[PDB]
Amino acid sequence: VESFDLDHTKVKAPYVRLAGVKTTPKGDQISKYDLRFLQPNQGAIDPAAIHTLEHLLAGYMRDHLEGVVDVSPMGCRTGMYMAVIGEPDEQGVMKAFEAALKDTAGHDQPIPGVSELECGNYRDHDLAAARQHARDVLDQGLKVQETILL
Amino acid sequence: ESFDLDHTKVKAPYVRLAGVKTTPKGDQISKYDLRFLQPNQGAIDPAAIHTLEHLLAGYMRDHLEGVVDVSPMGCRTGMYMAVIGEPDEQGVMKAFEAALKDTAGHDQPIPGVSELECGNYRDHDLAAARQHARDVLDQGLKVQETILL
Numbered sequence A: 001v002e003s004f005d006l007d008h009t010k011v012k013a014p015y016v017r018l019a020g021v022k023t024t025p026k027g028d029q030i031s032k033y034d035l036r037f038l039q040p041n042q043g044a045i046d047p048a049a050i051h052t053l054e055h056l057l058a059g060y061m062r063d064h065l066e067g068v069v070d071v072s073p074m075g076c077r078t079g080m081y082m083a084v085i086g087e088p089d090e091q092g093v094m095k096a097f098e099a100a101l102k103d104t105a106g107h108d109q110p111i112p113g114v115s116e117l118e119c120g121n122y123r124d125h126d127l128a129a130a131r132q133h134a135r136d137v138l139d140q141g142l143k144v145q146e147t148i149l150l
Numbered sequence B: 001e002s003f004d005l006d007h008t009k010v011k012a013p014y015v016r017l018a019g020v021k022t023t024p025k026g027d028q029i030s031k032y033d034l035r036f037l038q039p040n041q042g043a044i045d046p047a048a049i050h051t052l053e054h055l056l057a058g059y060m061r062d063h064l065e066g067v068v069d070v071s072p073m074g075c076r077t078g079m080y081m082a083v084i085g086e087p088d089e090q091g092v093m094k095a096f097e098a099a100l101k102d103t104a105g106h107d108q109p110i111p112g113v114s115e116l117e118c119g120n121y122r123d124h125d126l127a128a129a130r131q132h133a134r135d136v137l138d139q140g141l142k143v144q145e146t147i148l149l
Ligand code: MET
Pocket: A054, A055, A058, A069, A070, A071, A072, B002, B074, B080
C-alpha cells in the first residue's frame, strides 16, 4: 500500500500531489492525485461535509479536467483522491482543482445527486461546511507538493 | 454515473461494475461498487470505514491484480475500487470475499496507523471493521445488476 509510504508529517497542506502513476498493459498512464485540504492529523473534515465535497468535486473536477475516472474522499478525511487517464500533470491538476474549488465555494444551488434514489446516505450532507472548506483552501493557497517518502 | 443508479432497487451486500472507461491505446479501467450496506438504511461509522480502507487496500491487492485504488464512498455504505482490466464482476466478487475473510480474521495491528503514515491515525476501529466484514460474509455476496433511474 503506497499510501503508507508518504511522510505525512512533512507535507504542507493544502496541496495537490501526484500520489502514483500506473500503466495499463499497452502503456497508457493512469495518474492518481492527492488533493489535500487539511494538514494530516490536525483535524478532519466532518463526514457530512466530505460527502458533499465528493458530490460537488465529482462534477466540478470533470468540468475542468479531461479524463477524470473518479473523485473519492479519503478515509482519513483530510483530502480526496482523484484518478485521471493521462500523463502526470501536477500543475494542470492544481489549476483544475483551484477552478473546481471556486465552483464549490460558490455553489448555492442544490447539491447534485442528493435524493434517496441517487445517493446512499442522502440525509448526510453539509453544503455550508463543504463550501467553507473550499474557501479555506483558496484562502490559504494551493501548491504542488513534493512526495517525501518514509 | 453514480447518480443514475437507482439506490432503492439494489440489494446489499453486493459487487457491481459501476463503469468502465477505454484508455487511449485500447485498454480498460473498470470501476466497482463494493456495497456493504443497503443504501439509506444506515452507514458505517467513519472510524470503522477508515480501518476497512486500510485493511482492504492491502487485502484486495493480495487477491486481485491491477488494483489502482480502493476508497471509501462518501455515503459510507460501501467502497469504490478501480482496476486496470476488462470488467470481471465474478472475479472481483471472489477477490472481495477472500479479502473480507482476511479482514474478519485480522487480529494484528492495523497497517499504516501512525502520524507518519496516516492522515487521521486516531480515527480507527478494528473491532467494528472486522464485524462489518463478518456481516457481509454472513449475508452473502452476489453480483448486482445496474438498475438505472
Ligand atoms: C457519489 S459522487 C461520484 C464520486 C465517484 N467516486 C466518482 O467520481 O465517480
